[PDB]
Design a protein around this ligand. Sequence first.
Ligand code: BCR
Ligand code: SF4
Lengths: 80, 80, 739, 729, 31, 69, 141
Amino acid sequence: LAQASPTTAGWSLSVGIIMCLCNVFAFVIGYFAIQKTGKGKDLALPQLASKKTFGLPELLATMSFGHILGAGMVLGLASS
Amino acid sequence: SHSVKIYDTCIGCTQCVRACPLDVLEMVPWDGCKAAQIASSPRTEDCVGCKRCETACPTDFLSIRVYLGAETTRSMGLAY
Amino acid sequence: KVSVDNNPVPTSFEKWGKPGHFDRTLARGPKTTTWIWNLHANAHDFDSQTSDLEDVSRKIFSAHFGHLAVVFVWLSGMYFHGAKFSNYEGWLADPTHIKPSAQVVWPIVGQGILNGDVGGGFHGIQITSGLFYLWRASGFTDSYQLYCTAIGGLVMAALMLFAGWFHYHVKAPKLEWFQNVESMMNHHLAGLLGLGSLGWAGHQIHVSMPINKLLDAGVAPKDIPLPHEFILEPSKMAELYPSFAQGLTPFFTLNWGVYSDFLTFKGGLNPVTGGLWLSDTAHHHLAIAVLFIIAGHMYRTNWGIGHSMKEILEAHKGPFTGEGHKGLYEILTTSWHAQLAINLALLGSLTIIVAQHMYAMPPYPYQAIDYATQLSLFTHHMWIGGFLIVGAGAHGAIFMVRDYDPAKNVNNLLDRMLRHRDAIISHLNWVCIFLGFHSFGLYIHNDTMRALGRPQDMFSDTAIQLQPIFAQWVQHLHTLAPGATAPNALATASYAFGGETIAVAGKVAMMPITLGTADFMVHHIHAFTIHVTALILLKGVLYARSSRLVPDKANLGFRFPCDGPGRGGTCQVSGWDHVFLGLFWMYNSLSIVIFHFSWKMQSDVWGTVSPDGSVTHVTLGNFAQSAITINGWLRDFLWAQAANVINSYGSALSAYGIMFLAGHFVFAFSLMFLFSGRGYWQELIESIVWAHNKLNVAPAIQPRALSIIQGRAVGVAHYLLGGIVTTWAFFLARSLSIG
Amino acid sequence: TKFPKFSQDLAQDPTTRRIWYGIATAHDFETHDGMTEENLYQKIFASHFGHIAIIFLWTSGTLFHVAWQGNFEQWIKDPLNIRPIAHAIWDPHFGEGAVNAFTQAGASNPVNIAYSGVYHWFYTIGMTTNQELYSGAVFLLVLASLFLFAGWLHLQPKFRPSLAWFKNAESRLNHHLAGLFGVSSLAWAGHLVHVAIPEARGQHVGWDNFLSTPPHPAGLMPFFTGNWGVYAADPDTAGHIFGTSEGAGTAILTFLGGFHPQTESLWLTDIAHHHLAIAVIFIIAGHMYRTNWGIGHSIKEILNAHKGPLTGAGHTNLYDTINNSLHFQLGLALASLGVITSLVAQHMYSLPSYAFIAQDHTTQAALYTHHQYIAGFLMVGAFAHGAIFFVRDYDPVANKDNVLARMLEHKEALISHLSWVSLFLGFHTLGLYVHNDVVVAFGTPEKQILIEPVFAQWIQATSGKALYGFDVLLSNPDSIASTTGAAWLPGWLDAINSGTNSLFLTIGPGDFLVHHAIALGLHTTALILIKGALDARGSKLMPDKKDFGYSFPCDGPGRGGTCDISAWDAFYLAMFWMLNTLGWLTFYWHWKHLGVWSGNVAQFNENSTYLMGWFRDYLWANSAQLINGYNPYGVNNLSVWAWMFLFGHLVWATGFMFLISWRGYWQELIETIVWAHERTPLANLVRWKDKPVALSIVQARLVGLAHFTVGYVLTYAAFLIASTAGKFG
Amino acid sequence: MALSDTQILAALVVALLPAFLAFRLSTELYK
Amino acid sequence: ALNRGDKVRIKRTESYWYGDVGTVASVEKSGILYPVIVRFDRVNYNGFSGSASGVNTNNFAENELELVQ
Amino acid sequence: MTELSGQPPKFGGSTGGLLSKANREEKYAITWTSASEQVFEMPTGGAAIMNEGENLLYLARKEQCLALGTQLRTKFKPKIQDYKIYRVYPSGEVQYLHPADGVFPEKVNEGREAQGTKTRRIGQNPEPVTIKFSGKAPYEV
Ligand SMILES: CC1=C(/C=C/C(C)=C\C=C\C(C)=C\C=C\C=C(C)\C=C\C=C(C)\C=C\C2=C(C)CCCC2(C)C)C(C)(C)CCC1
Ligand code: SF4
């Protein structure tokens, strides 16, 4: 057998140190990846400090990238 | 040289000189047609035998005829 | 961002009268018989009829809708043929014993002799396309479901026809919806290539898994009911595979380890049925689904994120290249022909990939039982690929003739191509000479040495060896790979690379293919023929615009025969005739590849296996000694395997021989068109006209000769069809009687 | 000057087409510049003597080979079960397996089995030793040298003949009918009387005894006074054995007919009497015309007085055309040679005149198809030269309202009706064959169409056969022609009704069908050559055909397209039809005699009606011993035939090269190759002196056709010889 | 029966002269 | 000599239109070489390879035509 | 005739152009005056950039030069009718070709003779046996 054994979401470490910081890194990338952000259909009117400042499609793009990158993190990290 | 002969049944459509891409035909005055112009070939030693001349004229068995005789690399169409 | 127009060209019936209204000189009438061929010639060349891209592109869109309609009619007809007038249930009750059949023949003129005893209590003609294995893999067990598929396909073909009529006659979009190629790319990677992958992943997980998991055990097809009572009742999934009972919770929590019970990485083949594991294909389709859905987020369409093609094409420029790829976006979003060449070339190579992956790794169950379906499927996909790739060459050439603009491509890549076209043709001629002398020369030397009976200086295993060490090394690497560098694959990728013999009920499925010196020389023959075809099509593309034989040939067009007997003679200077000879080279190369395929797998991997462990090939292993030469190729493959073709008469296979003789007749009739010119028979036709004028039964439409390019077209068509049909007759006649 | 020197038009260009055309037109003396009748006829006469020299030297060479390296006398010791030898083999590339597989027939060096059939010829004339064959070789060698010396002698300025000497037709006809055909046949008849008959009966005639020994016990005076029956007194009976005297009389001239009961040959007494009679009839026929005596005839008077009421002008002023156009008489001569060689081929298998030639089937088959291919070649050339005559030498004002003017007037109806005959015959031949094909494809041969060739059995029965039972006018004694009392009736009636010879074979429906196929090939090829000739001086596409000459590429893409319009192109499309009709003939003949010689005539009587047996029983099954000339185990004596078979196949495809692809693409390719030679380093130090170019259109068409022909004939010859030797070794 | 070497040389030396006089013929017929 | 609308038959024998009839179109001034322009209903061979239509009108003289009406 | 004043066009050079016959036997040249700077295509392959004023370009055959000339007539919206054709020899001499009179042969100008103009119909050609064994041919006479 010897397959790459995964674990369930422990909801104490597997979601916090793994993919939340990955979403943080996705926001960091979204600060320095998209050359042109704010012209979507909805402009994400409730601005904030550094989280919901640019726009809706940038937000969904960087959150989907955070999801796929954290999924890669938790699959390729656990049991090699 | 590819000898070219033109006979006395020319109308004067001037397609005959218009079609040849080697600038060998020329259009000369005359008195036996409505256009008062018969075609002529004063530079016969630089036509290659492409025979587009024989396709140009719409008269029945057209006044111009080309004949393939003694060939020269000048009139054979080479770049060397 | 959509933009449409209402009622651009209304429907009528009057335009069907007086045919040929699309052109300006073909509308005067049938003043000569060449007008009929001119009508049939330009009936689909919509680009030269009109000027702007608008109306012609609307015509293209409606033409695609018509093509989808007609292929849907064909598929519905095939499904109904397999449904009502076949032996699907009787074949499905058993495996290797009964040959399947999907066509009946009316006994009218003695045709009942053709309707032979296929087996299993039926008289008809044997199927070879392999649709039965597809329907068993999908999960078809009842005729009413197939009838439902047929009637649904027919009615949605009618739907497609109505959609095409609407999209051309009522609402036609502008240009602006078409050049938005980013939305095209995103939706095609996303919608077409992704949703189908997810849908078949669901079909394989829900339907194929339990149907095949109970069908391999020995359960009769009429015992279990339909998949819908499966999908209603999850307890059957739970009792079959205990991973279903955990729900979709492990998917969302990313604990995918429990899903490995039905999503596997087994690899190899299935020893029960000879096909691939259905769990492997389900895992495949889900993975490629994820890959394409990710891939469909490349490009900028309306929300800032993504990429634009103009910027990325400007972004690449080299020290040796110059200004770079500027100008590709305009010429490739303006001219349809360039994109057609691209898609046709990649579709042809993709079809070659499809056949080359079918033969070695049989994906469908019970395919490796009968060799006829395997061999016929492989060669048919290869022929389709050859046709498409030569057409890609043709349309690249006609793009360089017609739609190329020299102004907007200053110092461009195409400028460099037309700049060193002489160098490219030169060095490709040199490699052509190299592979010509050093591959066929080996066969001439080998035949000469065998003609003297001195095998001590021959090219064989028992002589001077030309051993393909690279292919053997890669085969050994693939044998060693699944134990070391592929930790999550218990079996191999395939046994075609190398491994142990995999058998099936009664017969053999696939053994490792040893590669001797004969295969080395054959592969060199292949590379030589592919190089020749690439040479002729590449010159036909590059020399299509200008040359220093005739510089103004682009002003004439693409389809012109010659430029007179001057310059020594200019017959077949245009790119059309380059394609006209490229078809012949395609025919030769693919004839060689399918002959090698048939003989190699009739000699090495097929046959009858004994239970003690020994196999027995039909040709008793002669490829290592008789394929090295060429006279042995003439006798041990052609004469030896033609006997089954020419001794099947009065039996159930007389039709294959009749098609064989008719194919030789069609080949011989092609020489009509190839050899002679035009004026000879136009003169002969004129003498016939005088004869008919003597009877005063002269036709109103004046009879004329076919044109020169028309004669070349009809000639290459007849030669190619004759070759294809006689090869098809020989292949099915030999590989159906093998048993 | 530069080669070629005979035309300044071909010495004005640096292209390699100058070299190709200088090879091409070296025999077209009319196209040469500064050219008159005198110079032309002198080169004619020189080239004729050179050719006769080539003929005699070739005969001397083959005779010397069969004398020296052959196995003639060991074949004299037993003449039936020993294969002859052509010559030994000197090739250093032979491995020892091929040496063991080629050294046979009692030889010590590797040899080849002779299939030319000259062994039976030299046996039936009586060349009983190798020294005599050496004497014959040196005799023809010095005779060839005599023709060389005379050919040089006549080209001196003092001995150059006049124009009128070549013009004198009547003396030529009288001489060639009398002093060429008559006295030579008299000499050959005397050779059979005094050499072939005694060497056949066994008694020796040497080079010192012939003047002493008489050829008959009685003298010349019974021939003189009243009784020629002394020479027809004691013929060789049916119990005769060759080379000895039991059952052998001493008659030299008789006409008992039939065959030889021992070896299936024609009696040498028949040949001698025949040659003598033909000598008499040609010597009588050689005295038609006035030459220098005032007695006889004139060509002009007989050819002008044959007028007509609705013919037109009859044959007026033709003498001025035939005597002043060499192409016309060349076409007539080649047509006569073609038909006479066809008759040679088709009479040599049925009525052979050599001992033991009816047993060695390989030589018989090879000689038949040899002379048949020669017939096809020579007489399609006759048609081509007639077309050239219409191109170059027709005279409208000299032949006004002539018969040839009528030919050019009704050429349209002539071509139309050749076409009608060709289409009718081809439609129904193909339809009959494919209906038979489809019917036997379904396993019910009772519905086949087997048309009995009733007229063939009718002429068979009226020629002597009684098997079919029609018994009309010859086999029945009730007719008035049976009780004629002639001296050929018992031998002929024995020959027809004996089922062991190839004469007047049994005829079935397959012969009817294949004869219709042959007549189809005839009519198609005739249509091709006739429209090529009769339309060489006018067409509504191009009536200026006489201005351009005979062989020109095209007349351009104008007027709808003019490719393949010359009469040369008519010959081009003609040659394939000639080869096909010859092929159909030879396949049918070879399969029928394979069925007869094997004894299984039923397979030809049944399988020939449908294509299956043509493609399977003959074309597939007889090729099995062909291809096994070299198995992976070992080789045998059939290696060279199989390898030449594949060689001819490669030649066929390598000519299908030029027969498909035309010039312009090839010109672009070779021009790019010239660019490759230009800019490359360390290769500009040498430059070509003759410009390279692609071949012309007409030359490419010619080389493709020539390749097609040589590959075709090589493959067929190899298959025929190898299969016939394998089946009946 | 048996052949002799002198016969082969005699044939060769009588066959030399047609070659020489044919060379002379080809020389004279070039004009 | 011939007037407009005459149905006239031609005898050049060096043309494609031999043994044909048709209607004369126009006659120009005297002293010209070929005055008689005739209109036919058939078509000659004129055109490039695979052309749709050729020509149907040519001019000749009086001394080779034959009026019929 | 003195010298060919101008400038080579702005081009990257092409390897499919001149060969050894250019410096060996003869080669061609063409000059024209451009109203404005634009882009054309050079008949031996590729696209070149012309400049305003006089431009000098070299070729090896008459077909290439006349294809280029017809391109400068019937491609650009300001029509160019100022192209002249020149041939040069390796001995250093130059010769003018076309238009020799100064106007195109499509039209008619005076000061010119007519040659190769036989006053006979198709069928009035002499029939070949009256030319048989003479140095001429039916088309020549
Ligand atoms: C191209 C041409 C030509 C032509 C040629 C030729 C080729 C010819 C021919 C022909 C031929 C190819 C012929 C043949 C023939 C033969 C015949 C026609 C026959 C017959 C018949 C009869 C009458 C018979 C009789 C008999 C009988 C009954 C039987 C037995 C025998 C006898 C004899 C007895 C010429 C040059 C002139 C001119 C120009 C054109
Ligand atoms: S010959 Fe014909 S094409 Fe030429 S100018 Fe005269 S009428 Fe016009």
